[model samples]
Target: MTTHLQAKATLHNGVEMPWFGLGVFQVEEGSELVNAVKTAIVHGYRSIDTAAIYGNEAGVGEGIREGIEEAGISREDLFITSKVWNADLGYEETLAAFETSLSKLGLDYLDLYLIHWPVEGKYKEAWRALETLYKEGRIKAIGVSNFQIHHLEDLMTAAEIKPMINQVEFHPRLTQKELIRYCQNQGIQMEAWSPLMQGQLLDHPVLADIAQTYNKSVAQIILRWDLQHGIITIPKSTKEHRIKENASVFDFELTQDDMNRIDALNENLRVGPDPDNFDF
Candidate 1:
């Protein structure tokens, strides 16, 4: 498929997920969120990532419909993803949460549905709910977010269905090398959340040098690094130029040495909560 983004990866379940998508994480409710989503779509983002916790599903839905009407793209051409939040974790609760998300997004079904987090001491039950939803054709694919190795192991041990992707916070500063490798070995795709390290690593001298060499921004350089490593990265942006810039990394190639330089920037730093100490 010809798209604005140059690269795509096939998930374990054989679904083609775009390498880059616009994330509406903190884009507030109402017009701001709607406009941003519209901006992203106009810039040729075919995939959109939002969660129930984000509380902008209505705005996202509106922007999506507007984009379709204005750009003449089919619903099938766009990939929409939503997640069940922490508070809703059991079988019935998860199913209800999916419906609520669908209602807010105005979609009959989701392209991808993820368990927002392993919370409420009901993630196993949540997984079963996701499996049932997949079976019933309510969701095309199901996965987990912010899951560690042991969490994955436990889910795998008890699940009748496997998770296709594990979404987590990953970047040059906080590279989850071992966890990523483990997921790869087990046939699970690693979906990166804070692929740009939330702009924390944007000014690192090493990445700046690499960006100079490639004639790209440090953000593009880091994103290219993720792509070369076969990780799916969703970089969030509200600005149209930034969204376009984020999608422009595919044309340049990063050498193995450059990859190593970026890889070596890892200091095991985490900007988010530690999975081991997670309580909710």
Candidate 2:
């Protein structure tokens, strides 16, 4: 029932991951990025998501250290995630990429690591690399991102370890019903990369109406909807107040009617690249 900011969903491997976290996707490498990561942790966010393609791991690493110190939490108290880029999706290349990401984050290990995109004929080798890392205890959990159901099935045929999470462009506009159901049935945790649609849905009248009913912001309503569906969500925001506000969704529960209303908003939309049709 995700009643708090620290609430977690257990992965198939038995690792506890926070239902809500901060995503540093387009937030670049700078003090603002560092502060956002730091402040989120101090304010009770136990998970942080970044990627090798984000190019901010160094700052994210600094922020994590500062946040840990200020919050008086150890490395183990937080869950950190990073990913291997598509170009690095191979056996040896993926292994080296993981080490590079680890050094940039200045962490001995990552709580979760993913293949940023499922490049056809490439991700399978990367999956093998991830499996090796997991077996060696370098990663607590390994997963993939932006993968459709076919990608998941294809990867699993050769994968010794099934991915623990499938992070994708999930939101009110792109509910991903079948993919979500497939992942749930397979015990793979589903995560939303752009749960707020990169602020595209903030002005929607339906969400606004629901927000008014609950006395919550439009963003809060959307995030709550994500949790209500049992999907882990990470919304990106550099502003301290927004970061705090984003995580304030634990206080209210959306009714089934409202949930359905939001669900009906789906048009199979996506703001990010599609795994099946993307050029890069």
Candidate 3:
């Protein structure tokens, strides 16, 4: 069966988010961000992920406006996600931080807002602020990033709203199976942050063979593996052709045997830190 490129997943809040999105993490602040976001929009990306820590919200906003003008796509057609940084973790501080993000992005409401990290000092208060924002209709959906099961449980026990998604550094090299399964059973979406494993897994022998068989790039194969495992992926790229290539994963399907083979590639090598042990 031929898979279509367009796939949507309904959030716990009932908001439909595109399975693939443009991640602007570590993208510099300037025309680079503008051009990259604009190019992604032109190439059929309706979802764009940014964060206050990226320090390029202004450029991202400009790129969104340019993409809208160039593509004639309405603002409602796009789903924009931004996160609150670790420095802004308290309830009131988080609210102020979100306001800054909204002002920078020039959006009235965010499609989704997340706590960028589980900062040791103020994560509980941050969760409260996120809940408040979601309740007040400022954000359509709210979640956390780099949160482990313990953090998630704490939030669930303390807050009124459960997180709609959990964005983490996930890839074939680091499958994060337990986290993924926990989110799945809890009705929370498992979002892959470093779906390409920061390009480290692209050269693995198994992924190479899969890419050769599908006539696709190693990145595409990795992304396809994520899709097959029912995970949402946000692969970062600043190049137009690379962005286009990243979205071309829907043309083929991985076999069950192939899925098992890819699953066997999991070595649990995490590029990012374990949230529980992270001091910062």
Compared with the true structure, all predictions reach lDDT values of 0.84, 0.92, 0.86
Candidate 3: where is the Cα deviation over 4 Å? 1-3
Q: Candidate 1's residue-wise lDDT over 97-122, tens digit each?
A: 99999989988889899998877368
Best by TM-score: 2
Model 2 Cα lDDT, one tens digit per residue, 1-280: 6899999899998999999999887766768999999999999999999999888899999999999999999989999999998888999999999999999999999999999998988889899999999999999999989888899998878779999999998898889999999999999999999788768988899999999999999999999999999999999899999999999997789999999999999998777887889977
Better of 2 and 3 by lDDT: 2
- lDDT by residue (tens digit), candidate 3, 60-162: 9999999988988888899999998888999999999999999999889999999989887698899889899888998889998998888888777778889
If the candidates were sorted by their TM-score against the true structure, best first, what order would they fall in? 2, 3, 1
Clashing pairs in 1: none
Query: For candidate 2, what's the RMSD?
Result: 0.8
The order by descending lDDT is 2, 3, 1
Worst 10-residue lDDT window for candidate 3 reads 1-10
